[PDB]
Amino acid sequence: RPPTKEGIEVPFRGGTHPHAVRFKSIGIAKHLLLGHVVRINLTDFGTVREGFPVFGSILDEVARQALQLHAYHTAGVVRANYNEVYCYLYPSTGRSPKSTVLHPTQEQLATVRDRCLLEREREVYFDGLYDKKTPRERLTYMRKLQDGTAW
């Protein structure tokens, strides 16, 4: 078979210093030039409200480094899990040619952030009451809801 490029993943964390963000963005641009599809995921960011601005700043840094290194790529839809916020950057390789550095707009980022915040809030306030055991787990979850720490 023709050699498939490895689907690399670059970890990120809420609270990374701008020097580390710059270095990781440089590495991301390097791998995009090499042709690897990269994945950017924020692991530890607390609530989804505080994890989105840092992700946007990371996207801006990656965009600047890609503009400097001539690594044109397209960013996919930003998907926020409960624990992480992740996105996929696809470089110009094979079937899909990409000649420009493309990033989601702030309007799209705000819509995604609102949707994910609603999803997380609805999940914590509704699903947890039913997805666990009734005699003890349900009572503990009700205690957490009363305390306000159920999130």
């Binding site: 078979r1 023709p2 050699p3 498939t4 490029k5 490895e6 689907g7 993943e9 994945r39 094979g94 079937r95």
Partner: protein, 623 residues
């Protein structure tokens, strides 16, 4: 006789009331849109013809959808061109009929689409039913193989010309009597990469597997959601409930209405003396193929889930190695892809989704690329068969320029009998033949070994082996099968491709330990792995120690070593097809079992006998 009575019942000038599709009650439902199903597609999930018919009916209004499937009666009971082998052996025929029943259940119970099953000549049955039903659009797939391309062309011509058929003679008629200008839409849906999307034209395509893989790297694959949406919206279209089966018919208390159709059986198709077609051997494999579409989807999901992706490439290798033919982790999806129950686009989407989900692993992309490479290899064989055309099925392959070293194709009925019965001396070839004859499927390495051994190893004609693999393998695709047979018989000698390897090389490479041979022939279990793949080398003491007596069980090889005429006699070289053999004592009258001229010996309905077939039968009778 069954074909004659079917013709006299349906293809009759008057078309009696019993064999007449009931008229609709609402005037709008008088017209409808018809679809033709065939052996190339028995699915309702990614059928381009079905989606196009649904869209046409939606555009026209409340136009009902009707489905017709006419079985090719010739393909089930007519003898092979060379050697008189069966075509669509009962093992394949049962699977085909079960898949047809599954498709009918899917259409009539889930989609509420009445499917009408007919037996006889497709080119006669289809246009007459078009005229009787008054269909405006007939949607069907494009068959491009001999005995299918010609029948498809005849069908579309007769649909365009509005031709009725009566089958006392071969007679056609105009549409003035029917006791709207219909149009036929032929769509291409067989290949994984749809035609007109290929990066290079077929005519100017360079003959090369690796070249086609590099082309499919750039080429795109059509999605399935677009057609799934049309299939889903098909349910909102009104349907003619009078054509649907009733509860009694579903329970089987009464036979289906005569205008609907009756699913044929083995005896009705022409298979005689079934006792001679019962292979009493040990089925070492532990996996089956449940016929159907939902079953195929479930099999795909289970193969993806249970870690079957390692069958493509072992983890962390990046280089193809010997396969494990004894494993159950292989994707046995070739029957479901050849019969059209599973669509290549759906399988590709499943592979892509699985790879994306497990992309965190650093090797799933290589396995996905290997699977896509195999699908593209199937498409490449389709394209090469289309390029070769009728030349693919002639002697010495399509290209005589590569056959300088090939002999004159010495043909021996007894040698072909032993080869097709698995009575050779190579354990790997014997095990592969046993698996193919019992299960109806064997691995790629087994197929390569069998075809090479018959064509180049023994000097027999390659068409005999190709037709025997057609008879046995339930996943028989004409183009893929014949192209691979030609390639591995050293007939098509395209460079920059897979090397043709010896049967001994395959045995030493893919079965070095001998698990596969010791599992499919457990009487050889005691032979050490050093002496397997060559048990004839053993002396009398060694064979008595290992419990394998040559001549008694597991006879001597077809290809004796140098000499072996002075140190061996008839006591050691035991015959297997003489007058007093078990093979004669079968069929409850005595003609033989499975093998050379089996259609002539057992088949009830034989059409256009040949001088070679008659001479072979006479020689078999004399011997």
């Amino acid at each position: 006789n069954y074909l004659s009575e079917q013709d006299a019942l349906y293809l009759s000038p008057t078309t009696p009331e019993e064999a007449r599709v009931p008229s609709a009650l609402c005037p709008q439902l008088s017209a409808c849109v018809m679809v033709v199903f065939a052996a190339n597609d028995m699915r309702v999930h990614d059928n381009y013809a079905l989606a196009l018919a649904a869209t046409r009916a939606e555009a026209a209004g409340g136009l009902p959808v009707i489905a017709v499937t006419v079985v090719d009666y010739r393909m089930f009971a007519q003898p092979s061109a060379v050697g008189g082998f069966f075509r669509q052996s009962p093992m394949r025929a049962r699977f085909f009929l079960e898949t047809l029943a599954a498709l009918r259940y899917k259409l009539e119970r889930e989609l509420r689409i009445p499917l009408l099953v007919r037996c006889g000549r497709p080119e006669d049955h289809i246009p007459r039913l078009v005229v009787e039903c008054g269909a405006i659009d007939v949607f069907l797939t494009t068959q491009y193989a001999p005995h299918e391309k010609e029948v498809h062309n005849d069908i579309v011509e007769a649909i365009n010309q509005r031709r009725w058929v009566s089958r006392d003679p071969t007679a056609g008629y105009k549409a003035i009597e029917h006791d709207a200008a219909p149009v036929a839409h032929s769509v291409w849906q067989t290949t994984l990469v749809h035609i007109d999307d290929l990066p290079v034209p077929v005519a100017s395509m360079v003959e090369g597997e690796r070249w086609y893989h590099d082309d499919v790297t750039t080429a795109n694959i059509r999605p399935t959601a677009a057609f799934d949406r049309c299939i889903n919206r098909l349910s909102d279209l009104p349907a003619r409930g009078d054509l649907l089966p009733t509860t009694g018919e579903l329970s089987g208390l009464e036979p289906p209405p005569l205008y609907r159709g009756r699913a044929p059986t083995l005896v009705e198709l022409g298979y005689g003396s079934p006792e001679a077609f019962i292979e009493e051997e040990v089925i070492a494999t532990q996996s089956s193929h449940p016929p159907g579409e939902d079953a195929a989807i479930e099999r795909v999901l289970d193969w993806l889930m249970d870690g079957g992706m390692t069958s493509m490439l072992r983890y962390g290798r990046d280089r193809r190695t010997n396969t494990k033919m004894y494993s159950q982790r292989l994707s046995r999806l070739s029957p479901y892809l050849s019969c059209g129950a599973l669509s290549p686009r759906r399988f590709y989407e499943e592979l892509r989704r699985f790879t994306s989900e497990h992309l965190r692993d650093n090797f799933v992309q290589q396995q996905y690329r290997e699977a896509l490479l195999r699908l593209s290899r199937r498409d490449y064989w389709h394209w090469m068969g289309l390029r070769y055309g009728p030349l693919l099925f002639y002697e010495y392959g399509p290209r005589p320029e590569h056959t300088d070293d090939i002999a004159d194709w010495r043909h021996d009925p007894k040698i072909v009998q032993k080869w097709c019965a698995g009575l050779t001396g190579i354990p790997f070839a014997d095990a592969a033949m046993r698996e193919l004859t019992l299960t109806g499927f064997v691995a790629d390495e087994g197929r390569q070994g069998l075809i090479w051994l018959l064509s180049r190893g023994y000097g027999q004609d390659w068409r005999l082996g190709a037709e025997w693999l057609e008879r046995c393998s339930i996943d028989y695709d004409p183009f893929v099968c014949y192209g691979n047979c030609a390639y591995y018989s050293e007939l098509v000698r395209d460079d920059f491709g897979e090397t043709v390897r010896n049967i001994h090389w395959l045995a030493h490479h893919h079965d070095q330990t001998g698990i596969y041979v010791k599992k499919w022939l457990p009487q050889l279990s005691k032979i050490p792995p050093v002496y397997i793949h060559r048990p004839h080398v053993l002396t009398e003491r060694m064979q008595a120690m290992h419990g394998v007596q040559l001549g008694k069980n597991y006879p001597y090889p077809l290809k004796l070593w140098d000499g072996a005429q002075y140190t061996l006699s008839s006591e050691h070289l035991t015959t297997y097809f003489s007058e007093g053999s078990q093979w004669h004592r079968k069929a409850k009258n005595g003609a033989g079992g499975s093998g050379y001229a089996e259609a002539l010996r057992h088949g009830t309905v034989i059409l256009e006998p040949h001088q070679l077939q008659s001479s072979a039968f006479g020689e078999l009778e004399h011997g």
